[PDB]
Amino acid sequence: GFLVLGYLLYLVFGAVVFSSVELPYEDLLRQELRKLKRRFLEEHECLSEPQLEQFLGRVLEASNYGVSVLSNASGNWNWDFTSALFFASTVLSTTGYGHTVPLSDGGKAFCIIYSVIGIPFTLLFLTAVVQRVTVHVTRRPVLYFHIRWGFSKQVVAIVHAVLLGFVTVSCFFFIPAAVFSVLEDDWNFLESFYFCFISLSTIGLGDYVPGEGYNQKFRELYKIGITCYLLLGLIAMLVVLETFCELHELKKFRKMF
Amino acid sequence: GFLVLGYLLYLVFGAVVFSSVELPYEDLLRQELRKLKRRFLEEHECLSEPQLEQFLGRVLEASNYGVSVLSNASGNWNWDFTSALFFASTVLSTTGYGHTVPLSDGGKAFCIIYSVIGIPFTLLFLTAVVQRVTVHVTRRPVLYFHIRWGFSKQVVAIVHAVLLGFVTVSCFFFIPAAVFSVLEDDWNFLESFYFCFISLSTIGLGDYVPGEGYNQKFRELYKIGITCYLLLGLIAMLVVLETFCELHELKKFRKMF
Numbered sequence: 001g002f003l004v005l006g007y008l009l010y011l012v013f014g015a016v017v018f019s020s021v022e023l024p025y026e027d028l029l030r031q032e033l034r035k036l037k038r039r040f041l042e043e044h045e046c047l048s049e050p051q052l053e054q055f056l057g058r059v060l061e062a063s064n065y066g067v068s069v070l071s072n073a074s075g076n077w078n079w080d081f082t083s084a085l086f087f088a089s090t091v092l093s094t095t096g097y098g099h100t101v102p103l104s105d106g107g108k109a110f111c112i113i114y115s116v117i118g119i120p121f122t123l124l125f126l127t128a129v130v131q132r133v134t135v136h137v138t139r140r141p142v143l144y145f146h147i148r149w150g151f152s153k154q155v156v157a158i159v160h161a162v163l164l165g166f167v168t169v170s171c172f173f174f175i176p177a178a179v180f181s182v183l184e185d186d187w188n189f190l191e192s193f194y195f196c197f198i199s200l201s202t203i204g205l206g207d208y209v210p211g212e213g214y215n216q217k218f219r220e221l222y223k224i225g226i227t228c229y230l231l232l233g234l235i236a237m238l239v240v241l242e243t244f245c246e247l248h249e250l251k252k253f254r255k256m257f
Numbered sequence: 258g259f260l261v262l263g264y265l266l267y268l269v270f271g272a273v274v275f276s277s278v279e280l281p282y283e284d285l286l287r288q289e290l291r292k293l294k295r296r297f298l299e300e301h302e303c304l305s306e307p308q309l310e311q312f313l314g315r316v317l318e319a320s321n322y323g324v325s326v327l328s329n330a331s332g333n334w335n336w337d338f339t340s341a342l343f344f345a346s347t348v349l350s351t352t353g354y355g356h357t358v359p360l361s362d363g364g365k366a367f368c369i370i371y372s373v374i375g376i377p378f379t380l381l382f383l384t385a386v387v388q389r390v391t392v393h394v395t396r397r398p399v400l401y402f403h404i405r406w407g408f409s410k411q412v413v414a415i416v417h418a419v420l421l422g423f424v425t426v427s428c429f430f431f432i433p434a435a436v437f438s439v440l441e442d443d444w445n446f447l448e449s450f451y452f453c454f455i456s457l458s459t460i461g462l463g464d465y466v467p468g469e470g471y472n473q474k475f476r477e478l479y480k481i482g483i484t485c486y487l488l489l490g491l492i493a494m495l496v497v498l499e500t501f502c503e504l505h506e507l508k509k510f511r512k513m514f
């Protein structure tokens with residue numbers, strides 16, 4: 001009741017603030033992309049608006065569908081054992097970057113069937129893998145702290161679980177942000193941090209995707225390393241979110257609302 | 258151990274089957290989109306490959322970033338109270354269609370901050386709303402069945418919870434698939450079912466997004482109706498997935514693996 005109105009109010013607060021900050025930039029880019037439309041068309045006097053409209057209709061449909069028209073088309077194979085292993089990790093993990101999606105009626109039908117049983121199986125996989133890590137990285141330090149210093153078990157967990165999140169946050173955001181800032185030359189640090197947040201959070205917006213380097217040296221090892229990092233981030237934030245959910249303070253908030 | 262290998266094996270099985278079915282179609286489309294590249298370039302002899310490569314570099318970057326270059330650019334406002342309410346519902350619900358994402362350094366920074374506290378708050382919202390529905394749609398019929406027929410409570414829940422999923426599945430897939438097949442003229446039934454599965458599942462691939470009708474009559478009421486349907490689907494599949502997780506058979510599978 002009260003929360004539902006608050007949630008609706010919260011999106012309303014979200015929509016105005018984005019309208020206050022994002023929309024002027026978007027109006028600027030939409031004004032400058034429309035400027036780009038008219039520069040590109042002005043440059044190519046031969047080229048006309050309607051045929052181009054149809055061409056981009058297909059090109060962007062495909063792009064939405066995954067088949068980037070970039071790299072002379074002979075760029076990276078959207079569907080190859082490694083890339084398909086990446087698509088399947090993302091669709092099973094719900095990230096759904098959108099850089100690769102099924103292109104056929106039959107292909108879509110298998111993806112549904114594959115994802116009806118695949119995703120529950122993958123939730124089982126991530127939950128089991130997450131459960132192991134909680135015993136090690138988070139539970140073990142808490143036990144050591146209480147025994148050495150001897151204060152109450154109830155107070156050590158709540159106060160110090162918060163401390164253990166910072167360790168995970170730095171390990172999986174800041175250091176990886178620097179790593180990604182080194183491997184991807186065309187990224188800054190802010191975009192890399194944004195990509196790491198969206199990927200681990202599972203939003204998978206798809207504006208930042210790794211492995212797009214033009215005929216880069218280690219495409220296969222790199223696609224599998226990024227796959228392993230993306231699961232690792234998912235496991236480590238399901239551990240952090242499990243611990244925050246376990247926290248008495250956050251738990252009370254849930255009970256209240 | 259055994260599961261982790263199986264999960265890795267499962268993606269390997271996934272990658273080969275997609276390579277067996279999707280890749281020939283993708284090779285066909287990538288062969289025919291490269292054909293489209295060379296038809297479009299062949300038609301426009303004036304137009305040259307490199308400048309076009311740069312132009313599409315920006316156009317598809319923006320498209321990834323959300324600003325579709327379609328509808329003379331003056332199409333729908335990516336960021337307006339309704340559309341922003343939709344972006345915020347999707348990013349909070351993790352769907353992340355990618356049709357709208359932050360375009361600025363400052364905008365990204367707020368989206369992170371907005372989504373650090375927004376998403377946990379939204380998980381709280383969906384969980385609370387889901388919890389209410391379970392008491393009504395699923396729990397009430399089970400109680401009625403046992404009293405009227407008098408068989409054991411343990412056996413009624415497990416056998417008939419499966420029955421209640423079909424009701425939810427038809428209510429939120431088949432009938433909505435027909436509804437979407439009516440509102441979106443350019444869709445078939447299969448694509449609509451695919452869109453409903455990905456959206457409710459939260460994959461949010463973004464190849465199917467509603468509200469793209471060119472200056473359609475009811476853009477605001479329609480964007481908010483689709484928003485309400487997408488939450489409703491999320492609530493009804495978190496109820497179905499809660500009940501399947503509750504099921505003794507599925508629970509045993511989790512315990513086993």
Ligand SMILES: CCCCCCCC
Pocket residue numbers: 129227228231261
């Ligand atoms: C503790 C098990 C880790 C498994 C990682 C798998 C990465 C592909």
Ligand SMILES: CCCCCCCC
Pocket residue numbers: 484485488
């Ligand atoms: C039972 C509460 C339903 C609220 C739906 C809100 C849709 C925007």
Ligand SMILES: [K+]
Pocket residue numbers: 094095096202203204205351352353459460461462
């Ligand atoms: K997603």
Ligand SMILES: [K+]
Pocket residue numbers: 095096097098204205206352353354355461462463
């Ligand atoms: K996406």
Ligand SMILES: [K+]
Pocket residue numbers: 064097098099205206321354355356462463
């Ligand atoms: K996308």
Ligand SMILES: [K+]
Pocket residue numbers: 093094095202203204350351352459460461
């Ligand atoms: K998701």
Ligand SMILES: [K+]
Pocket residue numbers: 094095096097098203204205206351352353354355460461462463
């Ligand atoms: K997504």
